Amino acid sequence: AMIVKEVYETAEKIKSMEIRGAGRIARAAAQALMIQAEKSKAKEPEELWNELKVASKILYNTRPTAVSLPNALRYVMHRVKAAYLGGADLETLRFTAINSAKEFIYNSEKAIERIGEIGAKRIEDGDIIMTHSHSKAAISVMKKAFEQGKNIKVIVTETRPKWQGKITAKELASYGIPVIYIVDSAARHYMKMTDKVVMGADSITANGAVINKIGTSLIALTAKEHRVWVMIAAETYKFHPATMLGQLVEIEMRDPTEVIPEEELRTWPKNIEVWNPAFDVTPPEYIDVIITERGIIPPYAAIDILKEEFGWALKYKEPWED
Amino acid sequence: AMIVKEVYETAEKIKSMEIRGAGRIARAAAQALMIQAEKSKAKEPEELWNELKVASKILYNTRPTAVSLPNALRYVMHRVKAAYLGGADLETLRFTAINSAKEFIYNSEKAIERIGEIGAKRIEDGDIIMTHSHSKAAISVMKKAFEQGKNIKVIVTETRPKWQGKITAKELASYGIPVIYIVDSAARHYMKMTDKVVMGADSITANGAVINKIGTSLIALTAKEHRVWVMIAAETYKFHPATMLGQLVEIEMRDPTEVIPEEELRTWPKNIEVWNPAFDVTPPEYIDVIITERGIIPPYAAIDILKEEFGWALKYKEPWED
Amino acid sequence: AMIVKEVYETAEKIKSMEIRGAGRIARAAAQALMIQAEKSKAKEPEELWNELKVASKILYNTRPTAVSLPNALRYVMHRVKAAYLGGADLETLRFTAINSAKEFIYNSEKAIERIGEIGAKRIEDGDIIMTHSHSKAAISVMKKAFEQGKNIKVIVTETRPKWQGKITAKELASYGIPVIYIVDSAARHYMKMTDKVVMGADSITANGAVINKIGTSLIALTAKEHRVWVMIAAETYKFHPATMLGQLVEIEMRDPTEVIPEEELRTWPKNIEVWNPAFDVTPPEYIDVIITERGIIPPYAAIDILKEEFGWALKYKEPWED
Amino acid sequence: AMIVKEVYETAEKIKSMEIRGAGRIARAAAQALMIQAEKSKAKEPEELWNELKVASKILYNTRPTAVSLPNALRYVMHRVKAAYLGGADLETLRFTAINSAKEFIYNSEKAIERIGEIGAKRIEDGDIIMTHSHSKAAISVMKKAFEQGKNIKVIVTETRPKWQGKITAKELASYGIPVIYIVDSAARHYMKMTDKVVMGADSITANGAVINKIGTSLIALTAKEHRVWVMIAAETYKFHPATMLGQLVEIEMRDPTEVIPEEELRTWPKNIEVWNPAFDVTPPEYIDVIITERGIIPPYAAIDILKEEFGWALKYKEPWED
Amino acid sequence: AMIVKEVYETAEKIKSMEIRGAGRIARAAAQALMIQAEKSKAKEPEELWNELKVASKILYNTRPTAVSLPNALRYVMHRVKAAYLGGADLETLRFTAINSAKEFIYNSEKAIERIGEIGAKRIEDGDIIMTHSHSKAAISVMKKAFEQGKNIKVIVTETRPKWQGKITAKELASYGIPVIYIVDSAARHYMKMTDKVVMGADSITANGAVINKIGTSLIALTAKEHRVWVMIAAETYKFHPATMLGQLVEIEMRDPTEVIPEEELRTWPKNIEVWNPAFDVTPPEYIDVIITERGIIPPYAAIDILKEEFGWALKYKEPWED
Amino acid sequence: AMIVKEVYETAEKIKSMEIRGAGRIARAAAQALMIQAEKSKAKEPEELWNELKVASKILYNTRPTAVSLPNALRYVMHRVKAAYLGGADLETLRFTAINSAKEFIYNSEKAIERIGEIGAKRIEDGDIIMTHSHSKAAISVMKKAFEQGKNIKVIVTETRPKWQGKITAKELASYGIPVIYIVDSAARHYMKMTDKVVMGADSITANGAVINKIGTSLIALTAKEHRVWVMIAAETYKFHPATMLGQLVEIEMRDPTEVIPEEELRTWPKNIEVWNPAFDVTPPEYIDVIITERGIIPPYAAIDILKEEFGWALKYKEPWED
Ligand SMILES: Nc1ncnc2c1ncn2[C@@H]1O[C@H](COP(=O)(O)O)[C@@H](O)[C@H]1O
Ligand SMILES: Nc1ncnc2c1ncn2[C@@H]1O[C@H](COP(=O)(O)O)[C@@H](O)[C@H]1O
Ligand SMILES: Nc1ncnc2c1ncn2[C@@H]1O[C@H](COP(=O)(O)O)[C@@H](O)[C@H]1O
Ligand SMILES: O=P(O)(O)OC[C@H]1O[C@H](OP(=O)(O)O)[C@H](O)[C@@H]1O
Ligand SMILES: O=P(O)(O)OC[C@H]1O[C@H](OP(=O)(O)O)[C@H](O)[C@@H]1O
Ligand SMILES: [K+]
Ligand SMILES: [K+]
Ligand SMILES: [K+]
Ligand SMILES: [K+]
Ligand SMILES: [K+]
Ligand SMILES: [K+]
């Protein structure tokens, strides 16, 4: 198959986390299949079908934990597959793909703004919010509360190994919002002064569990200890279909040198392993609500979100498979 | 008034954290008064006395949180005051200061060894152990349990902002102990494979609370959630006497440039604050045992230690005072 | 603009709490629009419509917390709006308002009876039951369980500041049920002899939280500490729709003279504030079941009730609005 | 009135626990109905109808706690009844009974196989599983996981008084799975080495509570204590529809001779009562997931299984009733 | 025996709670025995011995729950008894009693001031303190923090049935301290804004339990839920000797009409009992510290306080017994 | 080397559990030492000394977990050793052994009687008590309470594998106390009707943990869950001095034939391991009080029992050692 440059560049940048955030990763995965359909030089429908099959697979094997990525691919290729199997001609396939792909990106953008408006109603004036990592959705909520004229301060946790909290601190601060930057270790110490916790999701499971950035479960734990509300801002495509039939989510182990730089680690003894999980799993009992673009749920209603939007596809194979 | 440079240098190095760890800071300050005494050029007792008080004030105003420091100073200066007020001559006073400092240092070393001997009995063949920061007393326990031929593995938390875990990791490796190095955030995620938790203490309070490196309380919190024993390895001079009469322990707020380096921090907007507590406080309900040189205690028995060894001095002002 | 006195009197009495309890307030407001419609002197639909909206605004601005009230108003006014905008003539509109109000009142009465029938099955012969405030729906359950020949005894909390428990106590006694009357403070002390807890609800939220009379959350808290079932007896019109899209329920702050009578309160210094929340919020983790007219649910299933019966109206403004 | 031998045998074998396990009981009840219809000497529809009614009551009045039994009888008799009231002739009605029984029996075996497939995905290589009693659904999960190449070990609790664990241990051993057998008392002692708990259910209620063999709640409680996942393997016919309308599940109290043999018990004093509850009730807060043949649910979603598969029948009487 | 007027007046006023507060009750009990020794017209030592024996018994049978009362009597009569048994003449007995009695009252007064100074060190500037009932000792702590220039607000709970909170609110407010008065039911609702809880004791037990005003355990419970420190301000004579040898403290049941006034209650049905426990028992795990006049303890160190100050007397009969 | 028959019998009877219960074991060990001295044919002091050393080792190497045994041997052999090193002649040394054994045996019986007296005060009229295994100290508490006229009922858990509960039930029945006998699995089912839990101890550690019959921790855990008091009835020789210096108590693993009889076990597959821990370890957070003959303590005061009664011996070797 004749895969375009942009499909491979996008895959590289997902692996390397130059492109990161589960929402963004997913939009970018959709963008890539769109560009493959723009520039494809294929003559028949069945050539193009095959390019998009292979482009999808390239994109799926980049980073495993955020289901947002495969839900973007599925959004485009369920539609592309249906077109092809009902004998769409070539230009009818090229459009299905381009259009499905634009549908997903626009609905993503709209969902986040909507999550912002909903979640902000749960923020009270004077609140001190503690967040983790960098999440566009969590930030939509905090940003929207500030624009409503609520006076808020956000406690940004640093989020090692990759320092995501620096992006968050600068982002919120540039909107006018006062920020307090602290280390991940200081989360319990400042939980007493915290009124709310607002964080993202990479995968939400059937039973209510949230996979998000490493350290998320600690903040959640001690939030429960102190009765601070834990609010997970998360789009419906963060919800994980395969968990309905009993799959556990893969937790991405990233390279040791994101923790200890190569120049430093090569000097350390052989009997020190460095372990770099990218994500942990927060149980549902530590979660007050999940703010989706369709509204507030208890985390145990994740099963409904999946029943009604995703369940149907589980009897079929994946839409990029032979 | 005529204070030697070794006192001034010890101070500077305690502040900058070139000299660090509660016990070592204590030994360094004992040592500093020793050198003041050896090298003093005083002719009268009153003149040496005055040097020994001023040197004590300089050493005590360095770092507040770890009570080891003022306890070392008191061990020396109670004995210096008793001698001076009982009419000691110049050389009897100089030797009282010197010999007292030596007793403190010697007892500090013996206590850490004995703590290791005692704590090691609570480590079992096969144990995965999680620790935090760098604690001589904690390491002593792990080192001895290995030396007894137990096959242990230690999970070492990175301990930001100052990366104390690097020190711990390299040291444990160097005695032959396999290490797993993780970010602080990952402590709950790895608590399910952990069997024991073993950390140090900077100050231990009347009611059993352990003030220790920032993040300690999170590790204990989730340790307890999981039923993993939390064991604090701690010398009797870590116990805090002022807290018998209601005093709260000051928590050191250290320079923000330790968190975010100067060169970068000055590029950030005014409306980000960086906050950097060097310690947090862990409740007694989350501690299984404290391991002192005199044996295993439940945390609530902190008060006995304080009664029988320290309470006598609480009717009197500090032995360095005018 | 030409509003009858029955609407004005119903309002005044809802405010003063002469008419009180979530369900009864709802029925009183349905009834108030009914009388507005029966007695209206309008010639045009537009003129009646306008009376029905203004009367609705007057009734809704009385007391905020209990969602029963605006739910009753909507039951009537959704149907009035649909008729008016579909071109109904004066008398078709008047009858739509009147007949809708009647359906609400009739359904309210049937629901409380059925709730009693359902809840009673969860009461067992011999049960000591603790309750709080005065709730029709809660009493219905206790009354029916007695009527079935179960030998129950009810602990009745006094419920300050308004002494709601006196009402509950006299009423339960009058059906033949032995009562034990205690101050609110004594609820933990008597929780060890309690078998069941049965209380009402003013608003139930998207995530399962029950807003109810002040003190409810304490009784549930210690009920849970003790493993005593907490059962909330509540009509579907107690469920709060705005909370699907992030709205927090306002908690009524009532006059301080209800706490400390006027004559006494004016003798007190300026620097005492009296604060008087009429409700508190009980988390879903402390609730065993909610008992509605449609059956037993776990609290987290609040969201289903809200979805299938109320969410449809959340794209539209209130049916009383200009 | 003309009930075949086979029905009376099934009933006796169910009461004496010669046939046992919730699913197998249900399959035996349907088998009996199937054999009543096959061998019936009834001449008219109304005569067969009456034999089946009576068979169904004989069967329902054997053992109360496991609802799998009445759900089997309902499955058949709902269909048999809908035929009879439509005016179905004799051989038409005999086939509704015969075929509905076979549908139930086949779907049962299919459901359990699929529970195995789904629940096995939650077992990870290396896992140690604690189980309780003898559940065919739980065993399917453990068997499948092992067949996938996962090296697991199973802690089989003995399950007094009927010694069920001996059956589970022998069985699992017979597939090549290493079993650790321990007494019920030791569940907490070994919870620290358990990774996963997997058990059956006799009845699952509307709020998520699980009724299973006596002991089950203790194992769930200490599992929650230690953060081990509790996974309930349960066919959808284990869910209890009467609970939707407030019913409490009856806890079968069986003979004291199953605890203390007749020989020994008769010598004991009169003032020793021997109580033998066959089941207990685990709350949903201690259950991570229910594995059904339609998927994984959080325990709070039990109410949906019921709304959507059994809720329709609650306005009618039992099908075997007049 | 010729008991003076003031012994009987004091007993009456303890029963009626005209004199109340455990410290005050005890000082007043001591005052009474003092006055009996002032005014006694007795000729021999053995007459006087007998008057004080009988005066003590009159005072002991007034209110049972606060051990402060009998510890005051014991303080005077251990001394009086020792005098008499070593053959003190009459004036030597009259003084022992008068003087012992003044010793107790002065040490009481001094202990409270000292509890104020200790406990205030645990109060931080800006703190919002929630209290219960009226306790001189709790107030000493809060009063002393305010005089130190810490800016504090106190949340006074009303404390039914007897309204103690009115005395507290007026008292604190008259010292300049801002007060918030709320009902006992509002304790959890305002626990989120509370930094510290400071309360009294009537009896502290060997194992750490605090008997204090009804409702105390609820505030403590929800304080633990929210991680607010519960500090019990309490003199060493609040500690309960008989608990060392396994006695449970009697919980005083006061007359129903303190709850519902006589004019009102006489009209209520016969099947309503009104239950008025004066006190409840807070377990030690909900208590952070006990501030005694000898300093801060964990509640589990109550056994030490009793071992060293009280243990010795338990092998002897009570000092007012024949 | 010349060890009498009686010592070898005691040892065998201890290993096979023909003599059992921690106290009774200890009394049997001292009895053996007493009989070794009485019947000794030794001519010199050093010869008797040597028989006693060897007897003590034979006895100590029977069963490890219950420390009552080594504390008995220590009581005697500390005294026997202090005599021998003072130069005591033969008949002087024989009497130290004989008399020290009798001192221990008499004080044991006295301690248990006094535990009964003390612990009975915590039983209230009406109480239902759950117990576990067969403890003479626990039984003393239940017997005394009943003898005081309190109408109690006792839930006797069966205590597999050795069926201890049958002994407890028969015994208690024999004093006229109504017993409910239940299997271990049912402890949580009946915890809701239990008012009080009362059990023994084999070893009590320095931090308060209680080692008792397998199952004990499950009963403590579900008791804590339901706020039932857990009361441990334990002689002061149950406290474990090695634990002061970090030692962990060994958990005796006994024969698999005590779980599954030899006849049956030999037929089973090789791939079923049967594990029989005889004890488990209850944490101090789940224990309300330890009832000793010197009084009630909170479990955290165990360290004082030890400091003040056994702490002296830890700098020396065992008395029976060379
Ligand atoms: N890898 C995973 N995939 C899906 N769900 C998980 C995974 N790990 C944990 N969970 C769920 O998330 C929660 C975390 O529980 P625990 O592991 O006990 O903290 C539980 O509900 C688990 O069932
Ligand atoms: N600065 C401090 N000095 C002494 N004790 C403290 C300090 N801060 C907290 N504590 C104690 O440590 C524990 C921490 O409580 P929490 O507020 O639950 O983290 C409590 O037991 C307090 O008594
Ligand atoms: N005003 C409110 N409106 C709606 N939900 C609320 C409100 N206040 C609290 N909650 C919810 O109710 C529960 C109370 O939480 P806590 O703050 O633990 O008492 C949480 O589940 C919140 O989601
Ligand atoms: O989709 P949004 O809300 O922006 O963020 C969702 C989550 O995905 C991210 O992972 P990574 O940085 O890609 O590894 C972060 O963990 C974040 O909370
Ligand atoms: O001794 P002080 O600290 O003043 O108060 C101690 C306690 O005694 C009181 O009881 P009551 O009003 O006599 O029934 C209150 O409960 C108060 O907390
Ligand atoms: K907070
Ligand atoms: K673990
Ligand atoms: K109860
Ligand atoms: K585990
Ligand atoms: K707070
Ligand atoms: K109970």
Author numbering:
A (entry chain A), B (entry chain B), C (entry chain B), D (entry chain C), E (entry chain A), F (entry chain C): 3 to 324
Kindly provide excerpts from the paper associated with this entry.
To verify the preferred molecule at the ‘AMP binding site’, PH0208-WT, PH0208-C135S and PH0208-D204N were crystallized in the presence of both AMP and GMP. In the presence of both the potential ligands, AMP outcompete GMP and binds to the ‘AMP binding site’ utilizing the similar set of amino acid while GMP binds to the ‘GMP binding loop’. During crystallization, even a higher concentration of GMP (4.5 mM) as compared to AMP (1.5 mM) could not aid GMP to occupy the ‘AMP binding site’. This further indicates a higher affinity of AMP at the ‘AMP binding site’. Evidently, when both AMP and GMP were made available, AMP binds to the ‘AMP binding site’ with a higher preference than GMP, while GMP occupies the ‘GMP binding loop’ only. Binding of GMP to the ‘GMP binding loop’ involves very few interactions which predominantly includes only the guanosine base ring of the GMP molecule. Thus, it might also be possible that the binding of GMP to the ‘GMP binding loop’ is an outcome of crystallization artifact. Both, AMP and GMP bind to PH0208 protein even after the mutation of the catalytic residues (PH0208-C135S and PH0208-D204N) at the active site pocket.
